[PDB]
Design a protein around this ligand. Structure first.
Ligand code: DHE
Ligand code: DHE
Ligand code: HEC
Ligand code: HEC
Lengths: 544, 542
């Protein structure tokens, strides 16, 4: 129940917590909470507790807290245990503590479902396909555009990769989690934490939302079809609540196929009523989407060639699947079962699990990870960790380097714990590692940079250069967190977000990759809480 | 609709009552809970979300109010809801208990996962310790496995001598018997979710392994793809909503899959999609699983249980029973409440057709395949809701215009039919009328002569066999049910199903003459229902 460096990246169900619920009746031995009391506790539960314990209280990273279990424990125990407080989220009073203890002793209702009728009611096509351009009608350099989340403003900025000019600021769902691009690079898809999806046509003279839809109450992932021949055919979104994924028309967003992720855990084979959808990727080898289902530890390969006779492969992997990426060849999916410190590898060509390996670190959090050619080991993919300062390398070349394939080849320290994103590009000799969640302001405001060319894999700890990103941005207020490297199309410049509060000063910092010197500082009154940044070309092509 | 009398034995605690509702005591609530599962959940659902009967969740029931609930339960309505109070089935006090129970929030029904299955799993004779060849002198392929429903037993009966070879104790109300592809192993599943596996090669065949796969179950099947004989068995449950693939030699539970998910058409989450018929493909190493409420047919590939390949086919809601055509390539199944037959191509793994039978509530069992003299290969079903028999063409290559089209429909004895039957060596098509309200019809079977069918649009005549009268049984109300042939297809057996404290029988009819051959009677023959010949079941010959 204490804040760690790796227990802050747990779901916060703040959109779902805005829904009012009814107070249940209380069985003998338990006291009922009033309407107000129950809702107040429920809002606290959904915001701060459901991430680890579940909205249904069947347990996730934290153990189940169902009524039968909590009534055996008793109020006093619950009261005392909750008095300490709970692990903080991303950067309780006496009355609240009692509310939570009492709430846990009552029978929870399941939040509303969100099916086809609800999706179709939210589904709006602003510009039908026939009314859209048939060629690019603006003079922008679309492939070198960066789509940047302006988190708390419920907007995104589209920024020129070469001139750093903000080309447009568009209204979207609240706190967009990620931007994804169609395979052709024409269509930009964004998903808000509230399950709102916007689809934007980059060919319009003034790009804007051409279609929108809501796919759930809580959602974090979206992806587009990337198999050759299937460009622009489909998009897919994944939700935390309800536990489901939805395949939508790539041109209109019409919801075509909704699949529940409720099911059995892979290992103990017990029913789990809240298996959240985490990362979603798209295969380059088959016409399939790659869907991580967290609590059950299943990776789904979903064939989108026929949605009525639906072929899937449900791969037993490891529990607590979160994020991941494809290797350099784009054949193998490498993903973190973070709470179990493991990297699961799937062969997307053959449709099967190939390996599961412990990184030796605490809570691997790769993002999409970093693929590079290690001077001694050959092709490798890398991840950093939230729980410690380590960077781990896994071999990704079964054909050319069989002895190194799917083995952890090295592990070495970077700036500190609380890292979220590691980054490189084929044209760069550098490996960048952030330390976003580190409690030390100077560490959280800097990035470690390793010289891949100097790496020998002799067992020593490779040295790194420390780039003072937040210092370069010149922000005197607060303790801004630096997060997520993203390259430009040419792989010559790498951008970082200098993420401060909504009413505080933020920036983007552009680093010249060849020299590791400051290239440019992006500041604008409209640049509020900049977080994720996605270069059109690097996102459409999965170049990382 | 089903009766979930196994969930009723579970004792639950009295839930709380929100503002504006009375609470029931522990005893009252438990009494109401038992009634709810024993008599109500079939139609209304375990979770009260509604199946054939409307949803009875607290949000809906509280708007209706106590008086409305009391009245509806007392008097019922013409649209399929029994008059519990005025019929005397429920006392006045029990009616009120049920109305009050419906206003309260139900305690979640118990799940039944791997830990629970493994705890119930018993291997009486390890594979190594079993015979290596048949150690009895029985003609196993001509043996019949007969359910003695209310006695929680089955009877192994010799197909030629009609001798009851053995009466074995199994789960309560075994629903069906199924055979492994080699014909060695006999699998039975009780309504309670209890599975028994019996080794027919033993000197005295008995249960060699057993396991429980859920609270309420109706289906079991064995792997029938060439090369996969005896490898797996699969069981399907009504509750929890799931199927489980088990080791074909030990019953070890290997893979449990939930069937909770989205309806095919409106795409709305359904929390209780019951598993209905389960068949086994002869074209791929797959199981064919009907999921009723969501209208999905699952093709589950058992070649790799860790990297599990399935095909989830959108079909039609209310899927129940069905069978393979004569070629064993196409699965034809009744989406019964919608009066449709759904056809799946098991080779290509896709839906090929959905056709209305023109009848009310088709109920084929596994159906009846034959070569119609003018139409070609056809598959037939009778109906629960009317007296009709419908034929569908099953030959897309050889009779293209006729394929997957209803080619003819004609009357048999009356409504309430459950099973239609034929065999490749017979020229006759037998149709029961088990649930008909008239005793003369419920105790008789219609027999059509396939050779005389002209498909000229006229209705084919049938002979009426007085099966119950042949048995010498009038006492109570004996209902005749389900034709099953012997291995040679020269005799057909029917069950004369009477009450547990009444006299039942099995009637053996000579297929060549359509005359009474033999009547099987025994004090042990309590409530005989399903009968399965070893050879015809192992080979899917129907
Ligand atoms: C499931 C998931 C993905 C993979 C998406 C995909 O494959 O399309 C992901 C990726 C991401 C990515 C993808 C980067 C990439 O290069 O792919 C980014 C930038 C991101 C910025 C943040 N994430 Fe993320 N993130 C969650 C979940 C996820 N984040 C959370 O449940 C969580 C922990 C809290 C929450 O309630 O949302 C969380 C907090 C954050 C942040 O505090 C971040 C830093 C800021 C923010 O804007 O809200 N998450
Ligand atoms: C899901 C299912 C199947 C397919 C099994 C398979 O594929 O392995 C089936 C088949 C069957 C078969 C298979 C015949 C065949 O030749 O395949 C038989 C004999 C049978 C005897 C009965 N069934 Fe059955 N049956 C149900 C369900 C099912 N019955 C019910 O839910 C229902 C409607 C009510 C109930 O509570 O069980 C019901 C009533 C009956 C009867 O009243 C029968 C006659 C006796 C009994 O115990 O309930 N059912
Ligand atoms: C993720 C970091 C957590 C958050 C946020 C909250 N809890 Fe938690 N809780 C978590 C863990 C890792 C554990 C220990 C057991 C385990 O799963 O390994 C717990 C434990 C509890 C308990 C104790 C129950 C017991 O059986 O001893 C309670 C009562 C509990 N948690 C309640 C609770 C509440 C009310 C929270 C919101 C403020 C909350 N937890 C947040 C992990 C996490
Ligand atoms: C299947 C034959 C049923 C069984 C067994 C029970 N019920 Fe039922 N019920 C059924 C149907 C098809 C309907 C629909 C209403 C109609 O007009 O026929 C109902 C309805 C009810 C209702 C009314 C709900 C409403 O009007 O919205 C109630 C309160 C109800 N049923 C209760 C109930 C109980 C308590 C039962 C066990 C004793 C029971 N039903 C059995 C079908 C069937």
């Amino acid at each position: 129940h204490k804040t760690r460096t790796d227990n802050r990246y747990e779901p916060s169900l703040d959109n779902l917590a805005q829904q009012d619920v009814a107070a249940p009746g209380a069985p003998e031995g338990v006291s009922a909470l009033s309407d107000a009391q129950y809702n107040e506790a429920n809002k606290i539960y959904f915001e701060r507790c459901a991430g680890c314990h579940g909205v249904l209280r069947k347990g996730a990273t934290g153990k189940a807290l169902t009524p039968d279990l909590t009534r055996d424990l008793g109020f006093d125990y619950l009261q005392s245990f909750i008095t300490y407080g709970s692990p903080a989220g991303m950067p309780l009073s006496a009355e609240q503590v009692d509310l939570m203890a009492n709430y846990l002793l009552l029978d929870p209702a399941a939040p509303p479902e969100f099916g086809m009728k609800e999706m179709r009611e939210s589904w709006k096509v602003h510009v039908a396909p026939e009314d859209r351009p048939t060629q690019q009608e603006n003079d922008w350099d679309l492939e070198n555009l960066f789509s940047v989340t302006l988190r708390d403003a419920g907007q995104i900025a589209l920024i020129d990769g070469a001139t750093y000019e903000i080309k447009s600021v568009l209204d979207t769902g609240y706190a967009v989690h990620i931007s994804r691009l169609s395979a052709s690079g024409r269509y930009l898809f964004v998903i808000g934490r509230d399950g709102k999806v916007n689809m934007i046509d980059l060919w319009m003279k003034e790009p804007t939302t051409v279609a929108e839809i809501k796919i759930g109450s809580e959602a974090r992932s979206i992806e587009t079809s990337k198999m050759e021949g299937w460009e622009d055919k489909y998009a897919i979104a994944g939700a935390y609540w309800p536990p489901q994924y939805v395949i939508m028309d790539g041109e209109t967003l019409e919801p075509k196929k909704i699949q529940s992720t409720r099911g059995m855990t892979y290992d103990e084979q017990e029913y789990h009523p809240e298996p959240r959808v985490a990362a979603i990727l798209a295969s380059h080898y088959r016409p399939e989407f790659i869907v991580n289902v967290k609590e059950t530890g299943k990776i789904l390969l979903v064939d989108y060639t026929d949605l009525d006779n639906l072929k899937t492969t449900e791969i037993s992997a490891e529990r607590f699947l979160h994020d991941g990426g494809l290797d350099g060849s784009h054949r193998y999916f490498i993903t973190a079962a973070n709470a179990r410190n493991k990297l699961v590898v799937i062969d997307t060509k053959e449709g099967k699990l190939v390996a599961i390996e412990d990184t030796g670190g605490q809570t691997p959090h790769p993002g999409r990870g970093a693929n590079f050619v290690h001077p001694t080991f050959g092709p490798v993919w890398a991840t950093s960790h939230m729980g410690d300062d380590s960077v781990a390398l896994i071999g990704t070349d079964p054909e050319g380097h069989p002895d190194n394939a799917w083995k952890i080849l090295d592990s070495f320290p970077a700036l500190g714990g609380g890292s979220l994103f590691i980054k490189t590009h084929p044209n760069s000799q550098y490996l960048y590692v952030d330390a976003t969640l580190n409690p030390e302001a100077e560490i959280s405001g800097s990035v470690a940079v390793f010289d891949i060319k100097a790496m020998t894999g002799d067992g020593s700890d490779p040295e790194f250069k420390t780039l003072p990103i937040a210092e370069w941005a010149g922000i005197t207020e607060g303790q801004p967190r630096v997060v997520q490297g993203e390259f430009n199309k040419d792989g010559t410049e790498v951008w970082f977000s200098v993420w401060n509060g909504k009413d505080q000063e933020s920036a983007l910092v552009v680093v010249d990759d060849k020299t590791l010197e400051l290239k440019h500082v992006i500041k604008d009154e409209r640049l509020v809480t900049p977080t994720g940044k996605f270069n059109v070309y690097n996102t459409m092509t999965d170049t990382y």
